[PDB]
Design a protein around this nucleic acid. Structure first.
Lengths: 204, 289, 132
RNA sequence: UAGCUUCAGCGAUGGAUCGGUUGCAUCGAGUAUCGAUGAAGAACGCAGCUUGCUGCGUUACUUACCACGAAUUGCAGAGAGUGGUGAAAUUUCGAACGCAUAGCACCAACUGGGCCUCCAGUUGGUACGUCUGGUUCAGGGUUGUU
RNA sequence: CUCAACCUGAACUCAGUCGUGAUUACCCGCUGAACUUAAGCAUAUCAUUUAGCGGAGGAAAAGAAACUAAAAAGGAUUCCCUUAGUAACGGCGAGUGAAACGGGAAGAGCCCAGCGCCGAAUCGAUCAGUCUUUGGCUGCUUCGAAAUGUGGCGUAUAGGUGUAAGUUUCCAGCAGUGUCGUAUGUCCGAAGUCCUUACGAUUGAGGCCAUAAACCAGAGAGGGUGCGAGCCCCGUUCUGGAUAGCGGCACUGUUGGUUCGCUUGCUCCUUGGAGUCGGGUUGCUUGAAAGUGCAGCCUAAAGUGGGUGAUAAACUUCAUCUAAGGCUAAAUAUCGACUCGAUUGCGAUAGCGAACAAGUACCGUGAGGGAAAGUUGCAAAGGACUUUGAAGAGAGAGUUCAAGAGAACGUGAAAUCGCUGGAGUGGAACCGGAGACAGUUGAU
RNA sequence: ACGUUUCCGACCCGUCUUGAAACACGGAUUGCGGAGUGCUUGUCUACUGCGAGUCAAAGGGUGUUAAAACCUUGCGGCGAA
RNA sequence: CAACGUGAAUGCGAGGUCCAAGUGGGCCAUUUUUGGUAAGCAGAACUGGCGCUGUGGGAUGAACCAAACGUGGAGUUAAGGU
RNA sequence: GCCGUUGCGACAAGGUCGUAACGAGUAGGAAGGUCGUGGCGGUUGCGUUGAAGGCUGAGCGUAGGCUCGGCUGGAGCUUCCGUCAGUGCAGAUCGUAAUGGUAGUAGCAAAUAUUCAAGUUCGAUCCUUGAAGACUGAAGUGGAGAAGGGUUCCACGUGAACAGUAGUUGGAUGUGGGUCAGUCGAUCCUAAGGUACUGGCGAACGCCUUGUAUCAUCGGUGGCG
RNA sequence: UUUCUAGCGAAACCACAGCCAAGGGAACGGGCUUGGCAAAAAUAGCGGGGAAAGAAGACCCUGUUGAGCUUGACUCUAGUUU
């Protein structure tokens, strides 16, 4: 029996909720277990990076996020070709391949091609047989500085830069921004009606 | 902690209803044993469920604002530098050289409890540990049965900046704690929520305090982003000097006493001097009479 | 303070282990210290007591009495020493049980295995005392 | 006086309270291991004296082997006895298997009855479904051949 | 009609296999309520949930887009935070109620059918050799499976042919050499039972050269010992040692098998799942709203076809995947089982029903129901002996710090009850106020 | 002062009820147990920190008196239309 | 903007916001009053009470008359009495 | 005169003091509680020269309650500061355990019935012997079995409990002993009926039919061997 | 049988308790007010009272409480016909 000015109740507790209860008392235990798993994996695959495969750069899908980039699943075959890396070779040297993604824009393709290039620059390849090196394998003293990498491979930078102050140009001021926006909206909204009118005029 | 969710509800118990001359509590079913026909379930019954059985999903842990945690740690550190507060908290600092007590980095090289004890004795800090020894005692209550057998006083805390594994020399001394200046624990700086823990700073730890906790300038702390020492609400914190200051004394007016009232009403119609004081002409009238 | 995460500081667990220890563990539990002279002579501090050892009572109402260990009643966690007896009502004599931790060994009943054990303990004591 | 009520002292009846605690509750961690090679469970039995509980299975409160190294204990009694446990062994019911479900019956071998077609004993074997292959088959179902 | 094939179907105590039945915490597939809320009640809610049935594992299931979406796009599955009590559903009432984008944990990819090429190049038993034999390797062993097609290449990222460049091994065991973990056994460890005192018994109190001092302390966790103990014992600390066993690695050798391949350019060729999809209707289900998912019946495809783009339909712009076949670790769930560590929990009417011969005694024909019950003392030293009695038992005595701790034994409350002394006592007794008496208590 | 004796006063408590000493109900006596809780979501109030900001989640890094504490957010919640 | 200056009695400090409990069976009396033959009956109006409240008096009594309450004392009284 | 509340005021104080007025209260609301209880983080101390608990004299407080003394007891307890709560009982025909008056009371009265002498025993209405007197009265108060019981059977001891008096006795209690089959039964046959196979159904555990539903269900003489 | 004796030995019930008249009161008091009165401890009977005990009235009403049954109630359904 609510009395007076109250917000109407909404609590979803009319089911037998006592049969489905989940607590979080094992949160620090899970943290410790995951740290130990990472340590074991690092020991297992040393000196390879603990994170694993190298991931690609990606624009966030929708216009709410399209000004931000993030790590993708892998590198498209177009990017691998642009960087001159075979898919088979990439799987061996630890680069993620996204067989579903395709590039439709030069800028997006180029960003990932450059990422692959810098990864190859930073790569250290051990000889397949320690006794006998080959072509492509890293040099002896290079193989001494090898160290296991922790965290993301080639982590992304999220710092925001500010455009340098400049002069306000006259042509910039003479533009009618609101009129332009409303004109674009109107043109899109009435595009079809004008086409219908044009077709009728042609038929007459 | 919680009780079993089925505790006290493991009986096929039904009420007898009215007409049997007994209370309508649910009663254990069957026969051939004492339990049969006895009350069940209710919190008033022997062997039933408690009232509102305590659940395991109670709010045990809390969210504490980071800003307020930092304020509390800074306040505890500041209070550790006041001799009076340590005495009020019970530490024996009668012959301690100086508060705060900063010692050479050589203490960070200590590796044997013998060396640590010698240093504490020569620093006139052994009185505190002696009191810690005297304070060991049996905990009163059920705690004894739950792996909390003894209660004893807390000693000083040694804070270091660069550990040459120095905490080993100090672990075994009762009451003495050891901390790293980078990760300072409020639970050890202000035990029981009380201010004035006795601290032994090493030189490196003392030097790192400005870096870790900043200054009164905004964002002066380098290891805590955006943190700086809180500013006081009162500049001069002593209430007597402000009152006795010349500026305040000039504005203050002269102290006064409680106003005085007659209190007792007498009977001038029955007394002489009272009436003659209130109305001097009455004496002349009586003289005329 | 203990550091081993697999060692329990639970009073209940400790008491349960002590009072349910099997015979070979009760042997180790029922250990007695050596006298000063025996300690300097053999190099060890304490040893699991054994029948036919000579002991001296160090505490209790029988402090100072000596004799030989007649039995090691591991079930009752006591030893029966020679000459340490009382008289029942009827007149029979019963040995008074003493806890081995309250006596000191004055002569070790040595055999092949006891000699090997003492050698091991002395070697370990020397090894650790050198490092300390 | 007696009885009754009440007070002080003493004593019964009763088992509250207090003092711990090898028990319980909850939280967390590590592992993946039942069964036709007969499981889970049940029944009966096993000890010098031992009903119950615990343990065990006809080698029956346990054998062998390995570690440690002198006991067990209520009374007796005479590498002990504990722990680990890789060898051996593991009764009858039970999916439960010859059929039935608290009973009775079939096949072989061997042994004894003197011989044995007849008895008795011992040992191996006889369940349902299903896969692969083997053997022996049936049907103008299709086909060839004489 | 004879013989011989195949096809189909049998019988075998034929040779050799496999399934059944348990467990419940989590997992997968079904079946499926009502109490209750709506202040009545029928849709709704409880709830796609108790209950019932089936089937696995250490995890299971899912899983490599017939996806999200509409950016300058993301890119298997699982899980967390957020989206969000939002869009939506609902006698539009009570109520119910997601997902993508975003930040993270973990991250791993692949195999068929079909088309095409080689075309039996493939495989099971059995026999004989041989080895490191609870299984493997060799065959003119002999049988059989397989052309109604086993194997090799190959699957949407495609693939293949030829060609030019580059580039080219990989598996499995055995022995050693070291390097490293073990909830794996066994063995090993620093310092007072020092003086005085207290006690029934100390671990309690005081003292132990020294300015800083009994001694050890990387050990002052815990337990035992006549309550109290770092120093009496087991233990504890030595990011402990020694030893045997198990593992994981790395390198050497060796054994057996295996490798005409792989990438990029050009060249020419090539490229896919049917009673399924879709549609109608019926029923259930969902937040899914002219149908989200599932199923019955009828209908029933196509091949740049098919699906989808959340308001149904034509006609149009496009965008995005490729259904009707299959495998796959991690992050995740779970103490039911085995083994461990803890606690602001309970302290014997509490905490599990069960601290104990507890799922026991006992009850019901059965399904099933189901208790009460902890404590002598440091040590039985558990009361010898005398005496009355048939005996229970009592009177002495003895043990003991103590027995008024005497076996149903720590403490031993209230109610109730008996005795001794005092005082009252006419159909209640208790009670408040005010004295008196008795009594108690204080007086430099 | 829970003893006796006098003088005055003095009906049995809890409860529902307009109204209970009631010929209204519960109560023979004593011990022990016994009932406004937990959590989710609101709202107001009080206190604390910061303030156009504030709190940061999952997570990560470190911590062996290591379930704590400490550090860490182009992004998220609420607020700023 | 300029000037004028508080214009009956008596008493007395005034105003604002927020959060929330219990209640939503009443009953009695003087006077007025409807139904009823009446009722310690049923239903209304104003006010005061009882409920929630003891105290002196009416022998006794929820409401009648007097008077309302910390805990004590002295004096004087109300209604009522000698 | 004293206590408190309210308003106002003085004072270098979360305090003290002064002053004037005031003090009813159910349901209900607030405030204070060095009122009381159990934990935790800290702090203050006491303890086998006697803690908790229990019984009860001198006091303190308006009260909740508290302090001390005496006796019992034998191992823990406690001040203050924060914070937390399974935090206070007279009731609920409350749960559980124990105990009263009733009260030495209701009552131990169906089935005809016992008496004498002796034995044993510490002890005899009740056990045993003998004599007498009665009863069931052969559709028995006799002699044996089926179901059911499960050692109750028999002998020797017996103190307590049980045998609603008693007990030397017992279906009680302690210790031992006792059940012998070719012919008596079971075993064997089938009845009413049950339950399998296949066969159908069923999401499934599994059900339905015992029937030409299903159906390739064998076994007998003889020769040969 | 009861009765008395020896042995044995419960239960129901119980706020506290038990002499009346009238009064007023919740309109039929053991208790309150005013009167009548008021002397131990007990045995056997008795059925006036304790509005005596047994049982949260099976009558009546209320409840947005049911169940058995009926049908021309509302909404469905096995089955069956087409």
């Amino acid at each position: 029996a609510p009395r007076g000015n109250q917000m109407l109740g909404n609590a979803h507790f009319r089911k037998h909720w006592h049969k489905r209860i989940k607590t979080w008392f094992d949160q620090p235990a899970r943290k410790l277990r995951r740290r130990q798993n990472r340590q074991a994996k690092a020991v297992e695959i040393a000196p390879r990076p603990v994170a694993g495969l190298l991931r690609s750069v990606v624009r966030c899908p929708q216009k709410r996020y399209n000004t931000k980039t993030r790590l993708g699943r892998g590198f498209s075959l177009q990017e691998l070709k642009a960087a001159g890396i075979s898919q088979a070779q990439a799987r061996t040297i630890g680069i993620a391949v996204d067989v579903r993604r395709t590039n439709k824009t030069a800028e997006g393709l180029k960003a990932n091609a450059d990422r692959l290039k810098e990864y190859k620059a930073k790569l250290i390849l051990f000889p397949k047989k320690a006794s006998a090196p080959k072509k492509g394998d890293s040099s002896a003293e290079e193989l001494k500085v090898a160290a296991q990498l922790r965290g993301d491979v080639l982590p992304l930078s999220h710092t925001i830069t500010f455009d340098e102050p400049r002069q306000v140009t006259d042509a910039e001021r003479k533009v009618e921004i609101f009129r332009l926006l409303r004109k674009e909206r109107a043109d899109k909204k009435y595009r079809g009606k004008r086409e219908k009118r044009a077709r009728e005029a042609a038929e007459e | 902690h919680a009780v079993n969710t089925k505790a006290g509800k493991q009986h096929s118990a039904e009420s007898w209803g009215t007409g049997r001359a007994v209370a309508r509590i649910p009663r254990v079913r069957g026969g051939g044993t004492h339990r049969s026909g006895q009350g069940a379930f209710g919190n008033m019954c022997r062997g039933g469920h408690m009232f509102a059985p305590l659940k395991v999903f109670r709010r045990w842990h809390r969210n504490v604002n980071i800003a307020q945690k930092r304020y509390a740690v800074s306040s505890a550190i500041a209070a550790s530098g006041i001799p009076a507060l340590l005495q009020a908290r019970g530490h024996v600092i009668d012959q301690v050289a100086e508060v705060p007590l900063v010692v050479s980095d050589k203490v960070e090289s200590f590796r044997k409890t013998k060396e640590a004890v010698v240093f504490l004795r020569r620093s006139h800090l052994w009185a505190d540990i002696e009191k810690v020894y005297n304070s060991k005692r049996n905990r009163a209550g059920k705690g004894k049965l739950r792996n909390r057998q003894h209660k004893q006083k807390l000693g000083p805390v040694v804070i270091y900046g660069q550990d040459a594994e120095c905490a080993r020399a100090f672990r075994n001394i009762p009451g003495v704690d050891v901390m790293n200046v980078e990760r300072l624990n409020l639970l050890k700086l202000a035990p029981g929520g009380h201010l004035g823990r006795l601290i032994i700073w090493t030189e490196s730890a003392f030097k790192k305090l400005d870096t870790i906790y900043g200054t009164t300038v905004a964002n002066s702390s380098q290891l805590k982003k955006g943190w700086s020492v809180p500013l006081p609400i009162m500049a001069n914190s002593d209430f007597s000097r402000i009152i006795r200051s010349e500026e305040v004394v000039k504005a203050i007016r002269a102290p006064k006493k409680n106003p005085v009232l007659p209190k007792v009403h007498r009977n001038p119609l029955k007394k002489r001097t009272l009436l003659y004081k209130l109305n001097p002409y009455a004496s002349i009238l009586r003289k005329a009479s | 303070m203990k550091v081993n995460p697999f060692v329990s500081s639970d009073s209940g667990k400790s008491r349960k282990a002590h009072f349910n220890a099997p015979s070979h563990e009760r042997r180790r539990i029922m250990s007695a210290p050596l006298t000063k002279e025996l300690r300097t002579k053999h190099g060890i501090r304490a040893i699991p007591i054994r029948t036919d050892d000579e002991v001296v009572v160090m505490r209790g109402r029988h402090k100072g009495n000596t004799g030989r260990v007649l039995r090691c009643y591991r079930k009752k966690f006591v030893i029966h020493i020679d000459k340490i007896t009382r008289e029942k009502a009827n007149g029979s004599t019963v040995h008074i049980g003493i806890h081995p931790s309250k006596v000191a060994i004055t002569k070790l009943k040595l055999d092949k295995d006891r000699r090997a054990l003492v050698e091991r303990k002395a070697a370990g004591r020397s090894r650790v005392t050198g490092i300390l």
